[PDB]
Backbone:
DNA sequence: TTTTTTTTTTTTTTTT
DNA sequence: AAAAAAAAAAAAAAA
């Protein structure tokens, strides 16, 4: 049956293939069904034969093209084929889908939308055809009326994002939109619908959706993606804290959304500026509720990107002193205790990060150590060698030692990085007051000399410097 | 130093990985490519010696370099990635997800890097020990299929290059079904832009000629290529075909030892008239040539008819009577001559390596056909300068897009190196009794190739070392005969004292000396591996006087070679070729008292006549004289005494002729002479 | 953040 | 009368 189609397609076009096409009018469905039953290469051969035998100048062949489009679109999902014929079908349709007027592509896109609403896309490999069609509506300068074809693309995108999406096709519907030339408003619609779809999914299918959102962010809308993922996982952290009143699921999910946002900041140095601007506490004085144990772990991981290190550590330093000023102001007055309901402070959030980091978050903990020693180095005493210069600086410097002492206990690899840096500040400074480092070294030692006999030589190399120290430092 | 540092002390260095990677990254952001090479080596050794966490940090760093990037840093990172997939693909496979993720960021990347990128990704992909993570196959297929299926040619070229690159790497029977399905997809997407199909043919051809790979898909495709060519262009030799043409259409430029009332002839004018598929003639013939060289191992037994078949062209007589018409028909003629020249260049590229002597005669007739069409086309460009027939080379010039000096190297098909097997033959002279412009053409090509390589698509995938290695055979013991025959011509031309013969041979002499200068100024001779090639090369230059003194010391071969070379200074017609001779002698004598020869020879060129043709004195232009007097004034032992010689003859210019007892001394030349005089006085 | 040096471009003058 | 060469001024990059 197919051999006469090949023999008419061999020599010339649109002179015998059209005439054979007006003999057999129906039953191309079961033809392609038995064709995929026998061989997929023959199906691609017949698709090329039909597509060259049915030009788009005449209007009789366009209906055969539409019917074979709906046939292949249903069989690429529903029909359990072999993979190569699937690739050849989608490649052939994607190639030949240029040559059309407006409304045929429009009703194709409407069939796609109406399918992805209700119709069980058995796999959903037909979706790859969808952006190509919309891309042709971007370049179809043939006028429509209901409009420009680009406006039909805007309306179809709005109809797709406003309607319900199925749970299984949010990764594929976001990955599709990476290839449509979108403006700001369309990509904000796509990210808004996609961020809306987070609560109705498996947790383990949130990191790749975040990844497609982060590569798709680069077009318009960075603030919305960052605000969305920080807000969603801050809410999850808080619900987990109330339920404690998944954790290796939640921590291994946040420990892969954090790397995605760090890598996307490395490849794109404006996603990092958007993250730093969106989280900064010092807007004028006021502490924001955008900081949480998630959103602070993300700042500590972005400190290993070398352009953001000083900027993010200085941000967390001013974000800790502001918290202690606020807490001192409330604790000194009942009138403020009546109004303000008891807020978690940045101190408690940081000490939650250090607890959380036990599992796999080694990326975070080299930034915890740097914040610890920035808090202690910057806020240690000097005035003995008052409340405002003293009590929110005493409380930050003792937050530092708490960061380093709790980080020292559980992270068995940044011993000798705290302990040779505590000692290096005790030994070498010896003119500036260093009581805080001797307190911290006393705590670190006293806690477990059983865990310091595995990192002991850092001690006995500071014994050789004991002669040149002042006497009180040697006694202490 | 860095190799010894890492390879000995990689236990001291291990615990400080991250600082090294913070260093390496700063030595890729710089210019000054020795620094960038250093940074590249830091990433290579950090990957090679450290443990499996630092390898992942290395690959992440290179991926950030590629994606974020600027041009040279991207190229360097792709070079390092090729070395890392060659070196240890096991530890590079564990970091396949980073490298797969490059595909989301291909807008920054330019298509000379895209070929390398898909090389890396396919070389990661097609190892049978990790078929279970075939996700990068799926993502590569997707980005290929989304590019290929696009109206925008800037994406379509990405698709074509990545597609055929995947195809070439997966060719080392199911796999053959995969390759043929992919290539059929590329063919289908290319068929309906012409230059897209041209780029397909070109890049597929480059894939054949660079990688030979398991020849199962090649013999699969070539049985379609030969048939498609022989029905696409091959017409039975009927004089006038159908169609309404205001031009007498014949079968021109047939070799005529072929019977005229025969089969194969090639349709051009009904094709290009139907356009207003002929633009793909030369690359498709290149593809046909390469697949039949892969099949029959260099034999072209069914394609010898392509060498001598007439071409269905209009009357390509110089249309000076066809003036006042610079309409679209003028562009038709210019594009026609352009296309047949590219076709002819592909023929002479095709049949140059063959050793049959009547076929060599056919090739030489093809070359003289080429030069006649070139002078006709430059006549047609002298008609109209504005009518560009824009068909660049598809690798670099087309993405730049999407008088005779530009199109001489950018527009025409590029000659191969083996085309210089032709000049084994000796010149014949038409006036005194392989012609002089048929040698001028090849030497004008070879000079441009040597200056491009040592100081151009198919050339630059060969290393400079293999280029100069094949130049050593295919120039020196072959062009020495042409040099000596030229010397014999200019001796008789001096004894006698038409003009176009001598005018062409002067440029032939100039190009021979320019090729010699470009060859012997090769900086790779400075490195201790290549002096044995010098112990070959100047030995052959030594062998033009006397043989028998084998295994000689170096400076003896230098002295014999310069003693051979000096004597040409009597037969030098012009100034620039003299400058090239003396600069050649300079750069060969820097391998060794020597200044006396150069100073005497510069004095000989200064006291030589150099006759008073207007364009001839124009070739004694200011900068060339400036360079020559810099050579003379620097290479004299007595600089101030030479200044007294020049100022002693600097005074009789006004007393004899308003032209001296020391020529190259006019009123106009004294600006140059004065400037070089007091400049060298200052130095 | 500032200064110097090199490279490129533009103009002017001289020559064919 | 047009073209080429040379110098001077301005821009850009590096310490």
Residues:
């Amino acid at each position: 049956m197919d051999q006469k189609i090949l023999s008419l397609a061999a020599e010339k076009t649109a002179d015998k293939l059209q005439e054979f096409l007006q003999t057999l009018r129906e039953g191309d469905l079961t033809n392609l069904l038995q064709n995929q039953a026998v061989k997929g290469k023959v199906a691609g051969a017949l698709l090329r034969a039909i597509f060259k035998g049915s030009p788009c100048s005449e209007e009789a062949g366009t209906l055969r093209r539409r019917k074979i489009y709906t046939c292949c679109i249903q069989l690429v999902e529903s029909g359990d084929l072999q993979k190569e014929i699937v690739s050849e079908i989608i490649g052939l349709l994607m190639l030949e889908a240029h040559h059309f007027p407006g409304p045929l592509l429009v009703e194709l896109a409407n069939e796609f939308i109406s399918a992805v609403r209700e119709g069980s896309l058995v796999n959903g490999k037909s979706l790859e055809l969808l952006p190509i069609i919309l891309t042709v509506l971007a370049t179809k300068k043939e006028n429509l009326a209901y409009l420009s074809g680009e406006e039909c693309k805007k309306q179809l995108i709005n109809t797709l994002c406003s309607g319900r999406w199925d749970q299984q096709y949010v990764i594929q519907l976001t990955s599709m939109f990476k290839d449509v030339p979108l403006t700001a408003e369309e990509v904000e619609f796509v990210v808004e619908k996609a961020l809306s779809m987070f609560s109705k999914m498996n947790l383990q299918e949130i990191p790749p959706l975040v990844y497609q959102l982060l590569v798709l962010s680069s077009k318009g809308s960075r603030k919305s993606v960052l605000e969305g993922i920080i807000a969603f996982f801050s809410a999850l952290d808080k619900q987990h804290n109330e339920e404690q009143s998944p954790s290796g699921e939640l921590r291994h999910v946040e420990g892969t959304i954090i790397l995605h946002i760090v890598f996307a900041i490395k490849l794109d140095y404006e996603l990092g500026r958007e993250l730093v601007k969106h989280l900064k506490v010092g807007q004028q004085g006021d502490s924001n509720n955008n900081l949480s144990p998630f959103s602070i772990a993300l700042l500590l991981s972005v400190t290993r990107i070398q352009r953001f290190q000083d900027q993010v550590l200085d941000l967390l330093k001013t974000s800790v002193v502001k918290s202690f000023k606020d807490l001192q102001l409330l604790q000194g007055s009942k009138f403020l205790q009546n109004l303000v309901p008891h807020r978690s402070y940045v101190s408690t959030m940081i000490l939650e990060v250090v607890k959380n980091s036990v599992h796999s978050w080694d990326h975070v903990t080299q930034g915890l150590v740097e914040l610890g020693f920035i808090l202690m180095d910057s806020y240690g005493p000097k005035k003995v060698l008052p409340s405002l210069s003293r009590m929110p600086n005493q409380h930050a410097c003792k937050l530092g030692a708490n960061i380093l002492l709790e980080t020292f206990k559980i992270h068995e690899m940044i011993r000798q990085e705290i302990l040779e840096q505590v000692l290096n500040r005790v030994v070498t400074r010896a003119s500036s007051p260093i009581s805080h480092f001797l307190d911290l070294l006393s705590n670190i030692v006293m806690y477990a000399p059983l865990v310091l006999q595995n990192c002991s030589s850092k001690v006995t190399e500071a014994f050789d410097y004991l002669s040149f120290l002042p006497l009180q430092t040697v006694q202490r | 130093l860095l190799q010894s540092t890492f390879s000995v002390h990689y236990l001291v260095l291990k615990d400080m990985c991250s600082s090294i990677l913070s260093l390496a990254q700063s030595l890729l952001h710089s210019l000054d490519q020795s620094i960038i090479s250093f940074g590249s080596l830091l990433y290579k050794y950090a990957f090679k010696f450290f443990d499996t966490y630092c390898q992942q940090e290395v690959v992440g760093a290179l991926v950030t370099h590629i994606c974020s990037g600027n041009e040279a840093e991207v190229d360097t990172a792709l070079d390092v990635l090729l070395e890392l997939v060659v070196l240890n693909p096991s530890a590079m496979m564990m970091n396949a997800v980073f490298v797969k993720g490059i595909l989301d960021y291909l807008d920054n990347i330019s298509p000379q890097q895209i070929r390398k990128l898909f090389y890396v990704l396919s070389t990661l992909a097609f190892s049978k020990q990790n078929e279970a993570s075939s996700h990068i196959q799926d993502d590569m297929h997707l980005v290929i299929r989304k590019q290929l299926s696009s109206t925008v040619f800037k994406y379509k070229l990405i698709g074509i290059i990545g597609a055929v690159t995947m195809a070439g790497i997966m060719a080392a029977d199911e796999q053959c079904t995969q390759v043929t399905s992919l290539l059929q997809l590329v063919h289908s997407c290319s068929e309906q832009s012409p230059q897209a199909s041209a780029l397909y043919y070109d890049e597929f051809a480059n894939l054949i000629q660079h990688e030979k790979l398991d020849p199962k898909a090649l013999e699969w495709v070539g049985q379609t290529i030969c048939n498609d060519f022989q029905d696409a262009f091959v017409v039975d030799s009927c004089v006038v075909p159908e169609g309404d043409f205001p031009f007498p259409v014949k079968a021109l430029y047939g070799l005529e030892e072929y019977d005229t009332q025969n089969g194969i002839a090639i349709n051009l004018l009904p094709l290009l008239f139907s356009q207003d598929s002929p633009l793909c003639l030369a690359p498709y013939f290149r593809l046909l040539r390469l697949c039949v060289e892969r099949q029959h191992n260099g034999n072209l037994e069914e394609i010898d008819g392509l060498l001598d078949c007439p071409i269905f062209l209009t009357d390509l007589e110089p249309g000076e009577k066809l003036e006042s018409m610079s309409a679209k028909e003028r562009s038709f003629m210019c594009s026609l001559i352009f296309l047949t020249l590219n076709w002819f260049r592909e023929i002479v590229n095709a049949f140059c390596q063959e050793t049959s002597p009547e076929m060599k005669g056919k090739v030489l007739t093809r070359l003289k056909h080429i030069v006649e069409l070139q002078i006709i086309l430059e006549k047609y460009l002298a008609v109209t300068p504005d009518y560009v027939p824009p068909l660049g080379n598809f690798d670099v010039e087309t993405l730049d897009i999407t008088l005779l000096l530009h199109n001489s190297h950018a527009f025409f098909r590029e000659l191969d190196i083996e085309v210089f097997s032709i000049l084994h033959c000796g010149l014949v002279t038409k006036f005194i009794l392989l012609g002089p412009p048929e040698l001028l053409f090849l030497l004008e090509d070879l000079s441009q190739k040597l200056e491009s390589m040592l100081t151009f698509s198919h050339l630059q995938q060969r290393s400079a070392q293999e280029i100069v290695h094949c130049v050593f055979q295919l120039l020196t013991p072959m062009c020495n005969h042409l040099e000596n025959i030229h010397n014999y011509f200019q001796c008789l031309a001096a004894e006698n004292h038409k003009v176009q013969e001598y005018h062409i041979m002067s440029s032939c002499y100039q190009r021979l000396l320019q090729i010699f200068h470009g060859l012997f100024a090769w900086s790779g001779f400075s490195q201790p591996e290549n002096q044995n090639l010098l112990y070959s090369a100047l030995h052959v230059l030594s062998s033009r006087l006397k043989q028998g003194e084998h295994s000689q010391p170096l400076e003896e071969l230098l002295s014999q070679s310069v003693h051979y070379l000096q004597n040409f200074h009597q037969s030098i017609p012009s100034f620039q070729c003299a400058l090239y001779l003396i600069r050649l002698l300079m750069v060969i004598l820097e391998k060794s008292q020597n200044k006396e020869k150069i100073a005497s020879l510069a004095r000989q060129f200064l006291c030589r006549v150099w006759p008073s043709g207007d364009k001839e004195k124009s070739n004694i232009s200011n900068d060339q004289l400036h360079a020559l007097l810099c050579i003379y004034l620097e290479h004299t032992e007595s600089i101030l005494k030479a200044i007294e010689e020049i100022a002693g003859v600097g005074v009789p210019e006004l007393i004899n002729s308003p032209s001296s007892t020391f020529p190259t001394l006019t009123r106009h030349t004294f600006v140059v002479f004065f400037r070089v005089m007091m400049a060298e006085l200052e130095k």
In short: Residues 183 and 383 of chain A are 58 Å apart (CA to CA). The interface with chain B takes residues 41, 44, 48, 84, 87-88, 90-92, 94-95, 97-98, 128, 131-132, 135, 139, 178-179, 215, 263, 266-269, 306 of chain A (CB under 8 Å).
